[PDB]
A paper describes a structure:
However, H109 substitutions by Gln or Lys, showed poor activity. Further, the overlay of all the structures of [name] H109 mutants showed that the overall structures are very well conserved with a Cα RMSD of ca 0.2 Å. As anticipated, we note a clear difference in the sizes of the active site cavities in the various mutants. When we arranged the mutants in the order of increasing cavity sizes (left), we noted that the canonical UDG activity of the mutants increased with their increasing cavity sizes to begin with and then with a further increase in the cavity size, the UDG activity declined (right). It suggested that the initial increase in UDG activity ([name] to H109Q to H109G) occurred because of the efficiency with which the water molecule could be localized to make a nucleophilic attack on the C1′ position.
[name] excises uracil from uracil-containing DNA to concurrently form a covalent bond with the resulting AP-DNA. Structurally, [name] is highly similar to family-4 UDGs (F4-UDGs). However, [name] is unique in possessing a flexible R-loop (105KRRIH109). Our earlier studies allowed us to propose a reaction mechanism of [name], which involves the formation of a covalent bond between H109 of [name] with the C1′ position of the target deoxyribose sugar concurrently with the uracil excision from this site in DNA.
Author numbering: 1 to 208
Write the structure that this text describes.
C-alpha cells in the first residue's frame, strides 16, 4: 500500500477515523509529534476548512486551530457571519512537523513535503467522504495544492469558486491565505489581508 491508505479504516465515523489516525505511520511525521490531530466538527457540516498541519499549540491541545492563527481565523469567521461550531476543520497533514531554535519561545513549524502531503491525503479523502461538504476552504499553499495540484498558486485565484474532477463529491473549492500569514506585517497590509480573508469565507458560505 502507499502512504496512510492501509491505516484508514472502512468507515465514515469521524470518531473511529480519528482513533485510527492515532495509530498512523503513513509517513515519518508521527515519530516526533505528540499525537495525531484529526479534524474537529460534525458530519452535517456544510463547510469544510483545511489548513496545512497542526502547529505547536494544536499538537498539544489535540485540536485544530487553537493558537494565534486560530484566534485570527475565529475573528474572520465571526466577521463573515459563519458559526465555527457548524464547520468541519482539519489540516492537510495530521502530525506537526517542527524544529526548535535555541532561545525560541515555541516549536517552529517546518513545511510538509509534497511526499508527506500525498501520504496523508487518504485521511483527507476519508474526511471529505464522511462529511460531504458543499464547499471546501483551502487555507494556504499546502492545503490548496493538496486538492488543486502541486503547481497551484493561491495568490492567483483569490475570490474564485473552483471545481476539480478528482475531488470526491465535487464540492466547490475556495483557496485563500492561511490565517498565520495575517499575524505579522505593516498594519495597513494586515487590515487589507484580513478583509480579503473575510471576503473569501463569504464566497464559500454563499455556495448553494
Ligand atoms: S502526517 Fe498523516 S500520513 Fe504522516 S504519519 Fe501522520 S497521520 Fe500518518
Amino acid at each position: 500500500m502507499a502512504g496512510a491508505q492501509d491505516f484508514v479504516p472502512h468507515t465514515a465515523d469521524l470518531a473511529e477515523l480519528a482513533a485510527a489516525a492515532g495509530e498512523c505511520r503513513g509517513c515519518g511525521l508521527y515519530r516526533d509529534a505528540t499525537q495525531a490531530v484529526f479534524g474537529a466538527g460534525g458530519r452535517s457540516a456544510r463547510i469544510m476548512m483545511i489548513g496545512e498541519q497542526p502547529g505547536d499549540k494544536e499538537d498539544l491541545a489535540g485540536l485544530p486551530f487553537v493558537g494565534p492563527a486560530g484566534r485570527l481565523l475565529d475573528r474572520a469567521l465571526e466577521a463573515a457571519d459563519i458559526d465555527r461550531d457548524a464547520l468541519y476543520v482539519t489540516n492537510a497533514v495530521k502530525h506537526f512537523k517542527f524544529t526548535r531554535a535555541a532561545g525560541g519561545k515555541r516549536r517552529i513549524k517546518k513545511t510538509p513535503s509534497r511526499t508527506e502531503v500525498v501520504a496523508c491525503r487518504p485521511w483527507l479523502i476519508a474526511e471529505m467522504t464522511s462529511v460531504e461538504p458543499d464547499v471546501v476552504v483551502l487555507l494556504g499553499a499546502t492545503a490548496a495544492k493538496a486538492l488543486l495540484g502541486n503547481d497551484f498558486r493561491v495568490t492567483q485565484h483569490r475570490g474564485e469558486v473552483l471545481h476539480v474532477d478528482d475531488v470526491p463529491g465535487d464540492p466547490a473549492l475556495v483557496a485563500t491565505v492561511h490565517p498565520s500569514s495575517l499575524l505579522r506585517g505593516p498594519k495597513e497590509e494586515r487590515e487589507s489581508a484580513f478583509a480579503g480573508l473575510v471576503d473569501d469565507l463569504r464566497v464559500a458560505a454563499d455556495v448553494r
